[PDB]
Design a binder for this molecule. Structure first.
Ligand code: HEM
Ligand SMILES: CCCCCCCCCCCCCCCC(=O)O
Length: 407
């Protein structure tokens, strides 16, 4: 079989579902970086992908992703009881009270940033979100962040996710940003352990710095650093979803009115933004033993990818997935496998994103501010979603003019 890495990279979000569509199947065999790969889509496929008796993550992450997006030694690369113990550390951070606290900090940082946006006249909304997110998440996590360093640190965190998948010198910047962010986070962990940094007992950096593994040993400082960055970086990546919130408000008739007057609408709206827009790329695992499924062979060791975007657009589940319709979530049964913008299955027993509560809370803050507080003009621009970009974004980055918050 031919290597299809280039075709995938040219259409990273839609390649799998388009090929599935052509074959009339929810799975097909392909090859990426010269490695045979079964590509899966849909709720039934997601349920098998999350069966940890059939799939493992250890050794499955391509080195280039380790050197940019994720780091090395983090929870994403663990299996079994080692994984579940590490995953508990992240899950303990996500209490309703703590999630609310981060959302409040973010609202405050967004409001603090507005005067600067007004003074600029014209802004690229996406570009402006990374710093307020960085400031909020650092404060929340007990990470000191001097005012004069916040801009630079926000740029480094952005590079980890925004420049990692760029086929350009930007990827090299992502690699340098990873080296810098790991070293910075390690100094934070070291300071906490030495008692020179006074992070609170409820904060992420404290929890991670003092986490004991299954042998009652502290994480090595590098691993602790990577895990701390696994809180900081993806919180900054919410800039992408906030940009999509602004995009939906701009391009979908009736949405703004519904959000303004119907209090229960915001929850439905944020979920539909997660369903509708591409963001999370396909997740990778490896078959842990020989099995067969739906007439497809999964030999032990076979690389397997789960298409999140395609699953979120599966007509069997949604009927009319092509339409942006928040109302559809009134009929959702909260199934753990059929709606998977940040993974499927169970949070404790699998690799599902622990950041979902934070993402939902911050997206609701964004939707609230964009319809009830923040006034802005939207000049003529290319708002179409760039499906060739990782992460995907409106081509313009969502340009605003005349931004103020006295409305
Ligand atoms: C910004 C939008 C986000 C998207 C699109 C996203 C998506 C995902 C996806 C697809 C996975 C992998 C699921 C799997 O491997 O089966 C994941 C895992 C993870 N996410 Fe997120 N996430 C986001 C935000 C967050 C936030 C805000 C946090 C932390 C505060 C976070 C922390 C993590 C961690 C630590 C993992 C690894 C969990 C594990 O391996 O057990 N994510 N995320
Ligand atoms: C060309 C080399 C490929 C590089 C790998 C591309 C990975 C970038 C993916 C961007 C999606 C962003 C989703 C957030 C992920 C996270 O924060 O953990």
């Amino acid at each position: 079989g031919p290597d299809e890495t280039l075709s995938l990279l040219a259409d990273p979000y839609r390649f799998i579902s388009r090929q599935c569509q052509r074959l009339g199947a929810n799975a097909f065999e392909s090859r990426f970086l010269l490695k045979k790969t079964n590509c899966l889509k849909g709720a039934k496929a997601a349920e098998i992908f999350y069966d940890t008796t059939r799939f493992e993550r250890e050794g499955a992450m391509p080195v280039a992703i380790q050197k940019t997006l994720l780091g090395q030694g983090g929870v994403q690369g663990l299996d079994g009881e080692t994984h579940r113990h590490r995953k508990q550390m992240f899950m303990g951070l996500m209490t309703p009270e703590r999630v609310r606290a981060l959302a409040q900090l973010f609202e405050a940082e967004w409001r603090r940033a507005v005067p600067g946006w007004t003074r600029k006249g014209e802004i690229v909304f996406y570009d402006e979100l990374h710093e307020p997110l960085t400031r909020a998440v650092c404060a929340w996590a007990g990470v000191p962040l001097p005012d004069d360093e916040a801009g630079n640190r926000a740029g480094e965190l952005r590079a980890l996710f925004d420049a990692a998948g760029s086929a350009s010198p930007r990827h090299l910047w992502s690699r340098l940003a990873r080296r810098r962010v790991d070293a910075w986070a390690k100094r934070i962990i070291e300071g906490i352990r030495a008692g020179s940094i006074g992070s609170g007992s409820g904060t992420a950096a404290y929890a991670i710095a003092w986490h004991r593994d299954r042998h009652d040993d502290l994480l090595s400082p590098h691993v602790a650093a990577v895990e701390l960055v696994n809180v900081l970086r993806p919180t900054v990546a919410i800039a992408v979803y906030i940009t999509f919130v602004a995009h939906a408000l701009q391009t979908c008739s009736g949405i703004r009115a519904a959000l303004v007057q119907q209090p229960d609408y915001a929850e439905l709206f944020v979920q539909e933004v997660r369903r509708f827009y591409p963001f999370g790329p396909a997740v990778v695992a490896r078959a842990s033993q020989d099995f067969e499924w739906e007439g497809m062979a999964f030999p032990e060791g076979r690389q397997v990818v789960l298409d999140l975007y395609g699953s979120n657009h599966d007509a069997a589940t949604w009927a009319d997935p092509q339409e942006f319709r928040p109302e559809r979530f009134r009929a959702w049964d909260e199934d753990s496998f059929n709606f998977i913008p940040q993974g499927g299955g169970d949070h404790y027993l699998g690799h599902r994103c622990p950041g979902e509560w934070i993402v939902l809370a911050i997206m609701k803050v964004a939707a609230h501010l964009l319809v009830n507080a923040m006034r802005y003009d939207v000049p003529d621009q290319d708002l179409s979603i760039d499906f060739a970009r990782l992460p995907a974004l409106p081509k313009s980055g969502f340009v605003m003019r005349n931004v103020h918050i006295g409305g």
